[PDB]
CSV table of C-alpha atoms and ligand atoms in Angstrom, one decimal:
chain,number,residue,atom,x,y,z
A,1,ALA,CA,-51.8,-97.7,124.8
A,2,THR,CA,-53.6,-94.8,126.5
A,3,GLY,CA,-55.7,-97.4,128.2
A,4,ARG,CA,-53.1,-97.8,130.9
A,5,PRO,CA,-52.9,-94.9,133.3
A,6,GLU,CA,-49.1,-95.2,133.6
A,7,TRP,CA,-48.5,-94.5,129.9
A,8,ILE,CA,-47.8,-90.8,130.4
A,9,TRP,CA,-44.7,-91.7,132.5
A,10,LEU,CA,-43.5,-94.3,130.0
A,11,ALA,CA,-43.9,-91.7,127.2
A,12,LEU,CA,-42.0,-89.1,129.2
A,13,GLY,CA,-39.3,-91.6,130.1
A,14,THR,CA,-38.8,-92.6,126.4
A,15,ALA,CA,-38.6,-88.9,125.4
A,16,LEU,CA,-36.0,-87.9,128.0
A,17,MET,CA,-33.8,-91.0,127.3
A,18,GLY,CA,-34.0,-90.3,123.6
A,19,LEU,CA,-33.0,-86.7,124.1
A,20,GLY,CA,-30.3,-87.7,126.5
A,21,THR,CA,-28.8,-90.1,123.9
A,22,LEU,CA,-28.7,-87.5,121.2
A,23,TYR,CA,-27.1,-84.9,123.3
A,24,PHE,CA,-24.3,-87.2,124.4
A,25,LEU,CA,-23.8,-88.4,120.8
A,26,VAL,CA,-23.4,-84.9,119.4
A,27,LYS,CA,-21.2,-83.8,122.4
A,28,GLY,CA,-18.8,-86.7,121.8
A,29,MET,CA,-18.4,-86.0,118.1
A,30,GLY,CA,-14.8,-85.0,117.4
A,31,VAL,CA,-13.4,-86.0,120.8
A,32,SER,CA,-10.1,-87.6,119.9
A,33,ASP,CA,-8.4,-88.4,123.2
A,34,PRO,CA,-8.5,-92.2,123.7
A,35,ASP,CA,-9.4,-92.2,127.4
A,36,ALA,CA,-12.3,-89.7,126.9
A,37,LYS,CA,-13.6,-91.9,123.9
A,38,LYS,CA,-14.0,-94.8,126.3
A,39,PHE,CA,-16.1,-92.8,128.8
A,40,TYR,CA,-18.3,-91.2,126.0
A,41,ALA,CA,-18.9,-94.7,124.5
A,42,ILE,CA,-20.0,-96.3,127.8
A,43,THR,CA,-22.0,-93.4,128.9
A,44,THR,CA,-23.9,-92.8,125.6
A,45,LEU,CA,-24.9,-96.5,125.3
A,46,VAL,CA,-26.6,-96.4,128.7
A,47,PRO,CA,-29.5,-94.1,127.8
A,48,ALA,CA,-29.6,-95.6,124.2
A,49,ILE,CA,-30.5,-99.0,125.7
A,50,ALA,CA,-32.9,-97.6,128.2
A,51,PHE,CA,-34.6,-95.6,125.3
A,52,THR,CA,-35.4,-98.9,123.5
A,53,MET,CA,-36.7,-100.7,126.7
A,54,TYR,CA,-38.9,-97.6,127.6
A,55,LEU,CA,-40.3,-97.7,124.1
A,56,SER,CA,-41.0,-101.4,124.4
A,57,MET,CA,-42.9,-100.8,127.6
A,58,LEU,CA,-44.9,-97.8,126.1
A,59,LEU,CA,-45.9,-100.0,123.1
A,60,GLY,CA,-46.9,-102.9,125.4
A,61,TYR,CA,-44.3,-105.5,124.3
A,62,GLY,CA,-42.3,-105.4,127.5
A,63,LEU,CA,-45.3,-106.3,129.8
A,64,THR,CA,-46.6,-109.6,131.0
A,65,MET,CA,-49.2,-110.9,133.6
A,66,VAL,CA,-48.1,-112.9,136.5
A,67,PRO,CA,-50.6,-114.6,138.8
A,68,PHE,CA,-50.0,-114.3,142.5
A,69,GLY,CA,-52.4,-113.5,145.4
A,70,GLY,CA,-55.3,-114.7,143.5
A,71,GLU,CA,-54.9,-111.9,140.9
A,72,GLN,CA,-53.3,-111.3,137.5
A,73,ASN,CA,-50.6,-108.8,138.1
A,74,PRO,CA,-49.1,-106.6,135.4
A,75,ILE,CA,-45.3,-107.1,135.5
A,76,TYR,CA,-43.0,-104.9,133.3
A,77,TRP,CA,-40.2,-107.4,132.6
A,78,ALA,CA,-38.5,-105.1,130.2
A,79,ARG,CA,-37.0,-103.1,133.2
A,80,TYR,CA,-34.7,-106.2,134.0
A,81,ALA,CA,-33.6,-106.5,130.4
A,82,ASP,CA,-32.5,-102.7,130.6
A,83,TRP,CA,-30.8,-103.0,133.9
A,84,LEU,CA,-29.0,-106.3,133.1
A,85,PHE,CA,-26.9,-104.3,130.5
A,86,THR,CA,-27.0,-100.7,131.8
A,87,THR,CA,-26.1,-101.3,135.6
A,88,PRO,CA,-22.7,-102.9,134.7
A,89,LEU,CA,-21.9,-100.2,132.2
A,90,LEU,CA,-22.4,-97.6,135.0
A,91,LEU,CA,-20.2,-99.5,137.4
A,92,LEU,CA,-17.5,-99.7,134.6
A,93,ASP,CA,-17.5,-95.9,134.2
A,94,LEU,CA,-16.8,-95.7,138.0
A,95,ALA,CA,-14.1,-98.4,138.0
A,96,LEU,CA,-12.3,-97.0,135.0
A,97,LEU,CA,-12.3,-93.6,136.6
A,98,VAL,CA,-10.2,-95.0,139.6
A,99,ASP,CA,-8.1,-97.4,137.6
A,100,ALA,CA,-9.6,-100.5,139.4
A,101,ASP,CA,-7.8,-103.8,139.1
A,102,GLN,CA,-9.3,-106.5,136.9
A,103,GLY,CA,-10.3,-108.8,139.9
A,104,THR,CA,-12.3,-106.1,141.5
A,105,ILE,CA,-14.0,-105.3,138.3
A,106,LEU,CA,-15.0,-108.9,137.8
A,107,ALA,CA,-16.3,-109.1,141.4
A,108,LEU,CA,-18.4,-106.1,140.8
A,109,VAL,CA,-19.9,-107.0,137.5
A,110,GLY,CA,-20.6,-110.5,138.7
A,111,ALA,CA,-22.4,-109.4,141.9
A,112,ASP,CA,-24.4,-106.9,139.7
A,113,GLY,CA,-25.5,-109.8,137.4
A,114,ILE,CA,-26.7,-111.9,140.4
A,115,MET,CA,-28.6,-108.7,141.8
A,116,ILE,CA,-30.5,-108.2,138.6
A,117,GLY,CA,-31.1,-111.9,137.7
A,118,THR,CA,-32.5,-112.7,141.1
A,119,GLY,CA,-34.7,-109.5,140.9
A,120,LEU,CA,-36.1,-110.9,137.6
A,121,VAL,CA,-36.8,-114.3,139.2
A,122,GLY,CA,-38.5,-112.6,142.2
A,123,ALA,CA,-40.6,-110.5,139.8
A,124,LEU,CA,-41.9,-113.6,137.9
A,125,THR,CA,-42.4,-115.9,140.8
A,126,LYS,CA,-46.0,-117.1,141.4
A,127,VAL,CA,-45.6,-118.2,145.1
A,128,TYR,CA,-46.2,-114.9,147.0
A,129,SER,CA,-44.0,-115.6,150.0
A,130,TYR,CA,-41.0,-116.7,147.9
A,131,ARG,CA,-41.0,-113.4,146.0
A,132,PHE,CA,-39.4,-111.8,149.2
A,133,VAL,CA,-36.8,-114.6,149.4
A,134,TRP,CA,-35.4,-113.5,146.0
A,135,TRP,CA,-35.7,-109.8,146.9
A,136,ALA,CA,-33.5,-110.4,150.0
A,137,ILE,CA,-30.8,-112.3,148.0
A,138,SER,CA,-30.7,-109.5,145.5
A,139,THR,CA,-30.5,-106.8,148.2
A,140,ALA,CA,-27.6,-108.7,149.8
A,141,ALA,CA,-25.7,-108.5,146.4
A,142,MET,CA,-26.5,-104.8,146.2
A,143,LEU,CA,-25.0,-104.3,149.7
A,144,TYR,CA,-21.8,-106.1,148.5
A,145,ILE,CA,-21.5,-103.6,145.6
A,146,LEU,CA,-22.1,-100.6,147.9
A,147,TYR,CA,-19.4,-101.8,150.3
A,148,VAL,CA,-16.8,-102.1,147.5
A,149,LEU,CA,-17.7,-98.6,146.2
A,150,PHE,CA,-16.9,-97.2,149.7
A,151,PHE,CA,-14.2,-99.4,151.1
A,152,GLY,CA,-12.4,-100.3,147.9
A,153,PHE,CA,-12.9,-97.5,145.4
A,154,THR,CA,-12.7,-94.5,147.8
A,155,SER,CA,-9.4,-95.6,149.2
A,156,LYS,CA,-7.8,-95.8,145.7
A,157,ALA,CA,-9.3,-92.6,144.3
A,158,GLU,CA,-7.7,-90.7,147.1
A,159,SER,CA,-4.2,-91.5,145.8
A,160,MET,CA,-5.0,-90.2,142.2
A,161,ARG,CA,-5.1,-86.9,140.4
A,162,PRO,CA,-7.3,-84.5,142.5
A,163,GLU,CA,-9.8,-84.0,139.7
A,164,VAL,CA,-10.3,-87.8,139.5
A,165,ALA,CA,-10.8,-88.0,143.3
A,166,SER,CA,-13.4,-85.1,143.5
A,167,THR,CA,-15.4,-86.4,140.5
A,168,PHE,CA,-15.4,-90.0,141.8
A,169,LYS,CA,-16.5,-88.8,145.3
A,170,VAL,CA,-19.6,-87.0,143.7
A,171,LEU,CA,-20.5,-89.8,141.4
A,172,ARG,CA,-20.1,-92.4,144.2
A,173,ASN,CA,-22.5,-90.5,146.5
A,174,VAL,CA,-25.0,-90.0,143.7
A,175,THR,CA,-24.9,-93.7,142.9
A,176,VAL,CA,-25.3,-94.8,146.5
A,177,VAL,CA,-28.4,-92.7,147.2
A,178,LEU,CA,-30.2,-93.4,143.9
A,179,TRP,CA,-29.5,-97.2,143.7
A,180,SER,CA,-30.6,-97.8,147.3
A,181,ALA,CA,-34.1,-96.4,146.5
A,182,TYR,CA,-34.9,-99.1,143.9
A,183,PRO,CA,-35.2,-102.1,146.3
A,184,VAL,CA,-37.5,-99.9,148.4
A,185,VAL,CA,-39.8,-99.0,145.5
A,186,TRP,CA,-40.0,-102.7,144.4
A,187,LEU,CA,-40.9,-103.8,148.0
A,188,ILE,CA,-43.8,-101.3,148.5
A,189,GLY,CA,-45.0,-101.4,144.7
A,190,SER,CA,-46.9,-103.8,142.5
A,191,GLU,CA,-44.1,-106.4,142.5
A,192,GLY,CA,-44.0,-106.7,146.2
A,193,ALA,CA,-46.5,-105.7,149.0
A,194,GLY,CA,-48.8,-103.7,146.7
A,195,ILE,CA,-49.1,-100.5,148.9
A,196,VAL,CA,-48.2,-98.0,146.1
A,197,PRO,CA,-50.2,-98.3,142.9
A,198,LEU,CA,-48.5,-99.1,139.5
A,199,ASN,CA,-49.0,-95.6,138.1
A,200,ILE,CA,-47.1,-94.0,141.0
A,201,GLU,CA,-44.5,-96.8,141.0
A,202,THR,CA,-43.9,-96.1,137.3
A,203,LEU,CA,-43.4,-92.4,138.0
A,204,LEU,CA,-41.0,-93.1,140.7
A,205,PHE,CA,-38.7,-95.5,138.6
A,206,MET,CA,-38.8,-93.0,135.7
A,207,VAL,CA,-37.4,-90.1,138.0
A,208,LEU,CA,-34.8,-92.6,139.4
A,209,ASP,CA,-33.8,-93.9,136.0
A,210,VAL,CA,-33.4,-90.5,134.3
A,211,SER,CA,-31.4,-89.2,137.3
A,212,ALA,CA,-29.2,-92.3,137.6
A,213,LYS,CA,-28.5,-92.4,133.8
A,214,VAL,CA,-28.8,-88.8,132.2
A,215,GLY,CA,-28.0,-86.9,135.5
A,216,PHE,CA,-25.1,-89.2,136.2
A,217,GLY,CA,-23.7,-88.8,132.7
A,218,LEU,CA,-24.0,-85.0,132.7
A,219,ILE,CA,-21.8,-84.8,135.7
A,220,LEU,CA,-19.2,-87.3,134.3
A,221,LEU,CA,-18.9,-85.9,130.8
A,222,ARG,CA,-18.5,-82.3,131.9
A,223,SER,CA,-15.5,-83.2,134.1
A,224,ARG,CA,-11.9,-82.9,133.2
A,225,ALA,CA,-11.3,-86.2,134.8
A,226,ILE,CA,-12.1,-88.3,131.7
A,227,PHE,CA,-9.1,-86.8,129.7
A,228,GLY,CA,-5.6,-87.9,130.1
A,229,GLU,CA,-3.2,-85.5,131.6
A,230,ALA,CA,-1.5,-83.7,128.6
A,231,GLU,CA,0.3,-80.5,127.7
B,1,OLC,C1,-35.9,-81.7,139.7
B,1,OLC,C2,-37.3,-81.0,139.3
B,1,OLC,C3,-38.4,-82.1,139.3
B,1,OLC,C4,-39.0,-82.3,140.7
B,1,OLC,C5,-39.9,-83.6,140.7
B,1,OLC,C6,-39.6,-84.6,141.8
B,1,OLC,C7,-41.0,-85.3,142.2
B,1,OLC,C8,-40.8,-86.9,142.2
B,1,OLC,C9,-42.1,-87.5,142.4
B,1,OLC,C10,-42.7,-88.0,143.5
B,1,OLC,C11,-43.9,-88.5,144.3
B,1,OLC,C12,-45.2,-87.7,144.1
B,1,OLC,C13,-46.4,-88.7,143.7
B,1,OLC,C14,-47.7,-88.0,143.5
B,1,OLC,C15,-48.6,-88.2,144.7
B,1,OLC,C16,-49.9,-89.1,144.4
B,1,OLC,C17,-50.4,-89.7,145.7
B,1,OLC,C18,-51.9,-89.6,145.8
B,1,OLC,O1,-52.4,-88.5,145.6
B,1,OLC,O2,-52.8,-90.6,146.2
B,1,OLC,C19,-54.0,-90.1,146.7
B,1,OLC,C20,-55.0,-91.2,147.0
B,1,OLC,O3,-56.1,-91.1,146.1
B,1,OLC,C21,-55.5,-91.1,148.4
B,1,OLC,O4,-54.6,-91.7,149.3
B,2,OLC,C1,-35.4,-89.8,118.8
B,2,OLC,C2,-33.9,-90.2,119.0
B,2,OLC,C3,-33.9,-91.6,119.7
B,2,OLC,C4,-32.6,-91.9,120.4
B,2,OLC,C5,-31.5,-92.4,119.3
B,2,OLC,C6,-32.0,-93.9,119.0
B,2,OLC,C7,-31.0,-94.9,119.7
B,2,OLC,C8,-30.9,-96.2,118.9
B,2,OLC,C9,-30.0,-95.9,117.6
B,2,OLC,C10,-28.6,-96.0,117.6
B,2,OLC,C11,-27.3,-96.4,118.2
B,2,OLC,C12,-26.3,-95.2,118.0
B,2,OLC,C13,-24.9,-95.4,118.5
B,2,OLC,C14,-24.9,-95.7,120.1
B,2,OLC,C15,-23.4,-95.9,120.5
B,2,OLC,C16,-22.8,-94.5,120.7
B,2,OLC,C17,-21.3,-94.8,121.2
B,2,OLC,C18,-20.5,-93.4,121.2
B,2,OLC,O1,-21.0,-92.4,121.4
B,2,OLC,O2,-19.2,-93.6,120.9
B,2,OLC,C19,-18.4,-92.4,121.0
B,2,OLC,C20,-17.0,-92.8,120.8
B,2,OLC,O3,-16.1,-91.8,121.1
B,2,OLC,C21,-16.6,-93.4,119.5
B,2,OLC,O4,-15.4,-94.1,119.5
B,3,OLC,C1,-21.3,-103.6,126.2
B,3,OLC,C2,-22.6,-104.5,126.0
B,3,OLC,C3,-23.6,-103.8,125.3
B,3,OLC,C4,-24.8,-104.7,125.1
B,3,OLC,C5,-25.9,-104.0,124.2
B,3,OLC,C6,-27.2,-104.9,124.2
B,3,OLC,C7,-28.3,-104.0,123.8
B,3,OLC,C8,-29.6,-104.9,123.6
B,3,OLC,C9,-30.8,-104.0,123.5
B,3,OLC,C10,-32.1,-104.3,123.3
B,3,OLC,C11,-33.2,-105.3,122.9
B,3,OLC,C12,-33.4,-106.3,124.1
B,3,OLC,C13,-34.3,-107.5,123.5
B,3,OLC,C14,-34.7,-108.5,124.5
B,3,OLC,C15,-35.4,-109.7,123.7
B,3,OLC,C16,-36.3,-110.4,124.6
B,3,OLC,C17,-37.4,-111.2,123.6
B,3,OLC,C18,-38.0,-112.3,124.3
B,3,OLC,O1,-37.4,-113.3,124.7
B,3,OLC,O2,-39.4,-112.3,124.5
B,3,OLC,C19,-40.0,-113.6,124.8
B,3,OLC,C20,-41.5,-113.6,124.4
B,3,OLC,O3,-41.5,-113.7,123.0
B,3,OLC,C21,-42.2,-112.3,124.8
B,3,OLC,O4,-42.3,-112.3,126.2
B,4,OLC,C1,-24.7,-110.0,131.0
B,4,OLC,C2,-23.8,-109.2,132.0
B,4,OLC,C3,-22.3,-109.1,131.6
B,4,OLC,C4,-22.2,-108.3,130.2
B,4,OLC,C5,-22.7,-106.9,130.4
B,4,OLC,C6,-21.6,-105.9,129.8
B,4,OLC,C7,-21.0,-105.0,130.9
B,4,OLC,C8,-19.5,-104.6,130.6
B,4,OLC,C9,-18.5,-105.8,130.4
B,4,OLC,C10,-17.6,-106.4,131.2
B,4,OLC,C11,-16.8,-106.6,132.5
B,4,OLC,C12,-15.7,-107.5,132.3
B,4,OLC,C13,-14.3,-106.9,132.8
B,4,OLC,C14,-13.9,-105.6,131.9
B,4,OLC,C15,-12.9,-104.7,132.6
B,4,OLC,C16,-11.7,-104.4,131.7
B,4,OLC,C17,-11.2,-103.0,132.1
B,4,OLC,C18,-9.6,-103.1,132.4
B,4,OLC,O1,-9.2,-103.6,133.3
B,4,OLC,O2,-8.7,-102.5,131.5
B,4,OLC,C19,-8.3,-103.3,130.4
B,4,OLC,C20,-7.7,-102.5,129.3
B,4,OLC,O3,-7.2,-103.4,128.3
B,4,OLC,C21,-6.7,-101.5,129.9
B,4,OLC,O4,-6.0,-100.8,128.8
B,5,OLC,C1,-28.2,-99.3,152.8
B,5,OLC,C2,-29.3,-98.6,151.9
B,5,OLC,C3,-30.2,-99.7,151.2
B,5,OLC,C4,-31.1,-100.3,152.2
B,5,OLC,C5,-32.3,-101.1,151.5
B,5,OLC,C6,-32.9,-102.1,152.6
B,5,OLC,C7,-34.1,-101.3,153.3
B,5,OLC,C8,-35.1,-102.3,153.9
B,5,OLC,C9,-36.2,-101.5,154.7
B,5,OLC,C10,-37.3,-101.9,155.2
B,5,OLC,C11,-38.4,-102.9,155.5
B,5,OLC,C12,-39.8,-102.2,156.0
B,5,OLC,C13,-40.9,-103.1,155.7
B,5,OLC,C14,-42.2,-102.4,155.8
B,5,OLC,C15,-43.3,-103.2,154.9
B,5,OLC,C16,-44.7,-103.5,155.7
B,5,OLC,C17,-45.8,-103.3,154.7
B,5,OLC,C18,-47.1,-103.9,155.3
B,5,OLC,O1,-47.4,-105.1,155.2
B,5,OLC,O2,-48.1,-103.1,155.7
B,5,OLC,C19,-49.3,-102.9,155.1
B,5,OLC,C20,-49.6,-101.4,154.8
B,5,OLC,O3,-48.8,-100.6,155.6
B,5,OLC,C21,-51.0,-101.1,155.2
B,5,OLC,O4,-51.4,-99.9,154.6
B,6,RET,C1,-30.5,-97.4,135.1
B,6,RET,C2,-31.1,-98.0,136.2
B,6,RET,C3,-30.5,-98.3,137.4
B,6,RET,C4,-29.2,-97.7,138.0
B,6,RET,C5,-31.2,-99.3,138.1
B,6,RET,C6,-30.8,-99.9,139.3
B,6,RET,C7,-31.5,-101.0,139.9
B,6,RET,C8,-31.2,-101.6,141.1
B,6,RET,C9,-30.1,-101.2,142.1
B,6,RET,C10,-32.1,-102.6,141.5
B,6,RET,C11,-32.2,-103.4,142.7
B,6,RET,C12,-33.1,-104.4,143.3
B,6,RET,C13,-32.9,-105.0,144.4
B,6,RET,C14,-31.6,-104.7,145.2
B,6,RET,C15,-33.8,-105.9,145.1
B,6,RET,C16,-35.1,-106.0,144.5
B,6,RET,C17,-35.2,-105.8,143.0
B,6,RET,C18,-34.2,-104.8,142.3
B,6,RET,C19,-33.8,-105.5,141.0
B,6,RET,C20,-35.2,-103.7,142.0
């Protein structure tokens, strides 16, 4: 375990996702409003899944070796198992906040599945040049998601309760900045061109993951937007 220099960031990531899960679980105890219950359930599940997949990486289960470029390269495949389930949940929190129509939700979740699934194929591909073909397809799926969040969701939020509009705008901006960083880290890190070493890459994804999951949830669950309007 300690024989891998990145273990300290995996240990810190496990601890922070675990503590985040417990805080949201205790906070949501006794919430009775049905609309608020939905946001607490979605938002508490996100760090609980990431906790399990950080632990699997720390203990060494979620790592495999992929030959390319005449080397055996360590690839943490557990990240994609986490993101397959947690990235659609985070998009569902945003879509429920703006009362998105069912067709737009399906479009978003399906494009997200394509983004993560092609990321995994690129991560496990043994022909070096083809890894970047899958990266480009996955990045095109991400750009579709960001387009909808700006030119679909913003338009509808603006016609809703003012607290819904202001909380959506903030969460939208957090999401666009943080999600856009992931394809860059992958391209310069050990899965791509190999310029940044694996221990620094693991630090960068841990800062991004905690911010995009526990930071995002702290903003959302402190807002009055998740409660129905009631006397
Ligand atoms: C909100 C409060 C928390 C704030 C925390 C945010 C920091 C995020 C981490 C960033 C990158 C820093 C990576 C550390 C730099 C190591 C690079 C290096 O030193 O490599 C040298 C090499 O030996 C010769 O080139
Ligand atoms: C050190 C601590 C480690 C971290 C803990 C280990 C995580 C794995 C265990 C359990 C799943 C617990 C339940 C996860 C689902 C929570 C959903 C929820 O909060 O629902 C609220 C809603 O209001 C209800 O109707
Ligand atoms: C609303 C939807 C909520 C969805 C909640 C789902 C949470 C699932 C969490 C965790 C375990 C993931 C386990 C992944 C198992 C992969 C095992 C495997 O195939 O390993 C192959 C081989 O043995 C070695 O490489
Ligand atoms: C493996 C990747 C896929 C599984 C990962 C799990 C992610 C979340 C699940 C589903 C999105 C499907 C559409 C769900 C949108 C329904 C929300 C809605 O429109 O409202 C309906 C409600 O009945 C009004 O009262
Ligand atoms: C809209 C927000 C999301 C946008 C996300 C898409 C961004 C794509 C950016 C850049 C490609 C730059 C490629 C630079 C890679 C060259 C690396 C190389 O081979 O150089 C060797 C190294 O520099 C010797 O030390
Ligand atoms: C909880 C973790 C989050 C919000 C992770 C988000 C991950 C992405 C937006 C990843 C995107 C990628 C690409 C667009 C292309 C290359 C590979 C990926 C999967 C890193």
